[PDB]
């Protein structure tokens, strides 16, 4: 709680959330778990969500979440990017070719959206 | 005419005996007409069609290039 008021806003910045899923992957087999549809762990969604839902802003305080997400093999539809995807209001994806075309920033005008 | 060369600049002439041979000039006329029909009947039919189907459905391929699943 702010001194005589509700808490100041929250500035949150995360780098490479995908690395979390990769770290889980590193051992997922060693837990004796069978592989999921791909080498990923079948638990994937649960540990993703428990992470994601700890980021919402409440009546008390507001949290501004910024997440850079690595894309494996530029496959937007790998399980991890797709599954992550449904937890954001603003979508921002970069296109390798456009950067190869020299433009900065290389933000796709098409895919990137915002619920606002 | 010259004392050694004579010629006619023909508005329209045909090696013929009489205007009855008009039944003959129209033969080449409609022949070239048929050819004029043919050039279109192939050109659009060959070019426009095949080239139309070429680029048609290519997109769904170019979008699924790096598919791992």
Curated annotation (Swiss-Prot), chain A:
One of its GO terms (cellular component) is plasma membrane. Its main location: membrane. GO terms for molecular function: ATP binding; ATP hydrolysis activity; proton-transporting ATP synthase activity, rotational mechanism. It comes from the Bacteria. Keywords: ATP synthesis, ATP-binding, Cell inner membrane, Cell membrane, CF(1), Hydrogen ion transport, Ion transport, Membrane, Nucleotide-binding, Translocase, Transport. It is found in: Cell inner membrane. F-type ATPases have 2 components, CF(1) - the catalytic core - and CF(0) - the membrane proton channel. CF(1) has five subunits: alpha(3), beta(3), gamma(1), delta(1), epsilon(1). CF(0) has three main subunits: a(1), b(2) and c(9-12). The alpha and beta chains form an alternating ring which encloses part of the gamma chain. CF(1) is attached to CF(0) by a central stalk formed by the gamma and epsilon chains, while a peripheral stalk is formed by the delta and b chains. Produces ATP from ADP in the presence of a proton gradient across the membrane. The catalytic sites are hosted primarily by the beta subunits. This is ATP synthase subunit beta. The chain holds residues 233 to 348 of 464 of the full protein.
UniProtKB/Swiss-Prot annotation, chain B:
It comes from the Bacteria. Its main location: membrane. The keyword Aminoacyl-tRNA synthetase does not apply. The keyword Coiled coil does not apply. It is found in: Cell inner membrane. One of its GO terms (cellular component) is proton-transporting ATP synthase complex. Keywords: ATP synthesis, Cell inner membrane, Cell membrane, CF(1), Hydrogen ion transport, Ion transport, Membrane, Transport. One of its GO terms (molecular function) is proton-transporting ATP synthase activity, rotational mechanism. Belongs to the ATPase epsilon chain family. F-type ATPases have 2 components, CF(1) - the catalytic core - and CF(0) - the membrane proton channel. CF(1) has five subunits: alpha(3), beta(3), gamma(1), delta(1), epsilon(1). CF(0) has three main subunits: a, b and c. Produces ATP from ADP in the presence of a proton gradient across the membrane. This is ATP synthase epsilon chain. The gene is atpC.
């Amino acid at each position: 709680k702010d001194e005589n008021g509700k808490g100041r806003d929250v500035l949150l910045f995360v780098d490479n959330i995908y690395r979390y899923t990769l770290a889980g992957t590193e051992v997922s087999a060693l837990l004796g778990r069978m592989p999921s549809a791909v080498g990923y762990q079948p638990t994937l969604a649960e540990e993703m969500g428990v992470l994601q839902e700890r980021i919402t802003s409440t009546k008390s305080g507001s949290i501004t979440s910024i997440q850079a997400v690595y894309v494996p093999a530029d496959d937007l539809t790998d399980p991890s990017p797709a599954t992550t995807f449904a937890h954001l209001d603003a979508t921002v994806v970069l296109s390798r070719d456009i950067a190869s075309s020299g433009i900065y920033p290389a933000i796709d005008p098409l895919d990137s959206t915002s619920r606002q | 005419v010259q004392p050694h060369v004579v010629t006619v600049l023909a508005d329209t002439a045909i090696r013929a005996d009489n205007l009855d041979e008009a039944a003959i000039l129209e033969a080449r006329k409609n022949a070239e007409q048929l050819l004029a029909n043919q050039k279109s009947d192939l050109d659009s039919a060959a070019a426009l069609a095949a080239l139309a189907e070429t680029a048609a459905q290519l997109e769904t391929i170019r979008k699924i290039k790096n598919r791992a699943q």
